Amino acid sequence: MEQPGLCGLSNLGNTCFMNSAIQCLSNTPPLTEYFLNDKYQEELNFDNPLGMRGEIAKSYAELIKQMWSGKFSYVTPRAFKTQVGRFAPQQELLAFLLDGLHEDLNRIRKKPYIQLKDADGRPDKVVAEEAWENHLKRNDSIIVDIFHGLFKSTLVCPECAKISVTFDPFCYLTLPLASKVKLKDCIELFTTKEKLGAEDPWYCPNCKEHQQATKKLDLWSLPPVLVVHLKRFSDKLDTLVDFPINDLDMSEFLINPNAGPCRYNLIAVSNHYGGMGGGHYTAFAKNKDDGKWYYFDDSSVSTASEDQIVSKAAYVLFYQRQDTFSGTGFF
Ligand SMILES: O=C1c2c(O)ccc(O)c2C(=O)c2c(NCCNCCO)ccc(NCCNCCO)c21
Ligand SMILES: [Zn+2]
């Protein structure tokens, strides 16, 4: 075709999930814009021991420039997949993709060792800000800017009443599934206090001993692009998760009381059809130039209506924060 971004991807074999993942990333406007304006050359990290000397970021840039040139109805991501395979010899490809891009473009030249401190008695605000600052001392890139948020973990040990509060970064949110359910039900279930199994207990440093310490997670800060992975694999759970296309307001789940509005509009959806033993991934994506929705099935690109987006096939959701929309301003 002749419109940039309406470009499919040939199936190199099975390459599970990679094409739909690339389409989700391709239709993440700030990421694609960063690559198309050649802002990535300045930031290529050539001797990061955790990176590919820039080869992942370079191959992704070439692929994205091809997809948004308007010259192709579909291309092959063969060089990109080759580099990704060298970075990750082998599931959730997305974490490895985001990590490969991040390290290839990390502004930190040499990561310093940071001694972990527990929250002690300090306020959540102080400890969260400390953790975010420490993270940026080790990880600072366009991938952090777009995708990273901060979550809280509270572990309470019944043996010695010890409470361990830690704040940790994330680049996507894996949600448990609660029969039809709403997305907010999955978020709510994500933040509920749980009892760790005997198969997965906590090593209490005060006790030098593992056992059933309660664990509860909380969202501290949410990124410009919130990636929400619905945990359908542990047989495959096909529950219809009803999620909004527009105006997802996350503020009720944020425990940072000085946080911003965090309202989101959906931009992409990774679908899976079948089960693990037999399955295929596709994607819905909103095109950044005309605002319409499209369906990407490898090389095939076609028009879509919002009627088709919310289905039980929905597997990963890409949301963009309304205050980060390019060329748009809220009051
Ligand atoms: O491609 C779909 C599919 C679709 O494009 C649109 C709607 C759908 O419902 C499907 C779909 O269900 C599907 C598969 N479903 C499970 C049947 N086999 C499972 C038992 O082994 C199992 C496999 C499957 N993919 C076959 C096409 N892929 C060829 C390249 O790998 C699909
Ligand atoms: Zn203990």
Residue numbers in the entry: 254 to 343, 353 to 440, 755 to 810, 817 to 913
Please quote the paper that reports this structure.
Ubiquitin-specific proteases (USPs)5 are key players in the regulation of important cellular signaling pathways through catalyzing the deconjugation reaction of ubiquitin from substrate proteins. The multifunctional protease USP15 regulates several important pathways in health and disease, including TGF-β, IGF-I, innate immune signaling, mRNA processing, and mitophagy. USP15, USP4, and USP11 share the same overall domain structure, including an N-terminal domain present in USPs (DUSP) and ubiquitin-like (UBL) domain followed by a protease domain that harbors a ∼300-amino acid insertion predicted to contain a second UBL domain. The USP15 catalytic core displays the characteristic USP protease domain fold, including a finger, palm, and thumb region.
Furthermore, we determined the structure of a USP15–mitoxantrone complex, a Food and Drug Administration–approved antineoplastic drug, which has multiple cellular targets, including USP11 (25), that shows a novel binding mode for a USP ligand. We determined that USP15 is weakly inhibited by mitoxantrone with an IC50 value of 33 ± 11 μm. Co-crystallization trials in the presence of excess mitoxantrone yielded crystals of intense blue color that diffracted to 2.1 Å resolution (data collection and refinement statistics are shown in Table 1). After molecular replacement, an additional planar shape of electron density was visible in the vicinity of the BL2 region near the catalytic histidine that corresponded to the anthracenedione structure of mitoxantrone. The catalytic triad in this different crystal form is also misaligned in both USP15 copies present in the asymmetric unit in a similar configuration to the USP15-free enzyme structure. This USP15–mitoxantrone complex structure revealed predominantly hydrophobic interactions between mitoxantrone and USP15 residues Tyr855, Gly856, Gly860, His862, which are located in the BL2 region. In addition, one of mitoxantrone's side arms contacts the CC loop Asn264, although the density is weaker compared with the mitoxantrone anthracenedione core. There are no interactions of mitoxantrone with other neighboring USP15 molecules in the crystal lattice. This binding site coincides with the S1′ region of USP15, suggesting a rationale for the inhibition observed. In this position, mitoxantrone is expected to compete with substrate interactions, as indicated by modeling a diubiquitin molecule into the binding site based on a superposition with a USP30 C77A Lys6-linked diubiquitin structure, the closest available USP structure in complex with a substrate. Superposition of the USP15-free and mitoxantrone-bound structures revealed that the BL2 becomes ordered, but no other major conformational changes are observed upon mitoxantrone binding.
